[PDB]
């Protein structure tokens, strides 16, 4: 829901259609697995 807006704006402005720098469905699960005292480290 935070990407479709960026996309509509990009297109109407004529700029390169963006790309999610790091996947986005992951963050709530990341939080709630960290909240359970399980260290998680998005690597790179």
């Amino acid at each position: 829901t935070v990407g479709r807006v960026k996309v509509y704006e990009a297109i109407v402005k004529g700029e390169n259609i963006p790309e999610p720098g790091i996947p986005e469905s992951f963050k709530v699960l990341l939080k709630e697995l960290q909240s359970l005292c399980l260290n998680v480290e998005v690597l790179s």
């Binding site: 709530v28 939080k31 709630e32 960290q34 909240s35 359970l36 005292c37 260290n39």
Partner: protein, 147 residues
């Protein structure tokens, strides 16, 4: 502990565990299990192996077993245990909330029982009653009858 006290150091609950993991060797127990699996095979070798599992799994890891014992417990972002009222004046709140509050209560309970100074046995009862809350806050339905 009255007589023969300073010759041994007894403890109760996870505290004792903490101690025996602080002044604890890993690669020593590891090589013990290795020489067991290579010298004292018998039938109880299965135990040597199933146990060195966790030891040689706790060797090149940046996580000492201390992570089991909790001296700093997190809470979940409120929105993930949501609470919202409908139109009219009536709430609708998650079910997990209860367990959290219980921990909170028990913590403060013990945190003032220290000032109450009751003998170690009321202290054991209250510590049991506070860790019974985490026993189910993470996975309720794991020991005996659940909440």
């Amino acid at each position: 502990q009255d007589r023969y006290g300073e010759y041994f150091t007894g403890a109760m609950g996870a505290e004792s565990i903490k101690k025996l993991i602080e002044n604890f060797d890993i690669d020593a127990e590891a090589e013990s299990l290795r020489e067991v699996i290579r010298s004292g095979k018998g039938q109880k070798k299965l135990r040597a192996l199933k146990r060195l599992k966790v030891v040689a799994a706790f060797q090149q890891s940046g996580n000492s077993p201390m992570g089991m014992v909790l001296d700093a417990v997190p809470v979940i972002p409120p929105e993930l245990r949501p609470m919202v009222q409908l139109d009219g004046g009536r709430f609708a709140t998650s079910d997990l909330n209860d367990l959290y509050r219980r921990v909170i209560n028990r913590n403060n309970r013990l945190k003032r029982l220290i000032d109450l100074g009751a003998p170690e046995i009321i202290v054991n009862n209250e510590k049991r009653m506070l860790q019974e809350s985490v026993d189910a806050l993470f996975d309720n339905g794991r020991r005996g009858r659940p909440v």
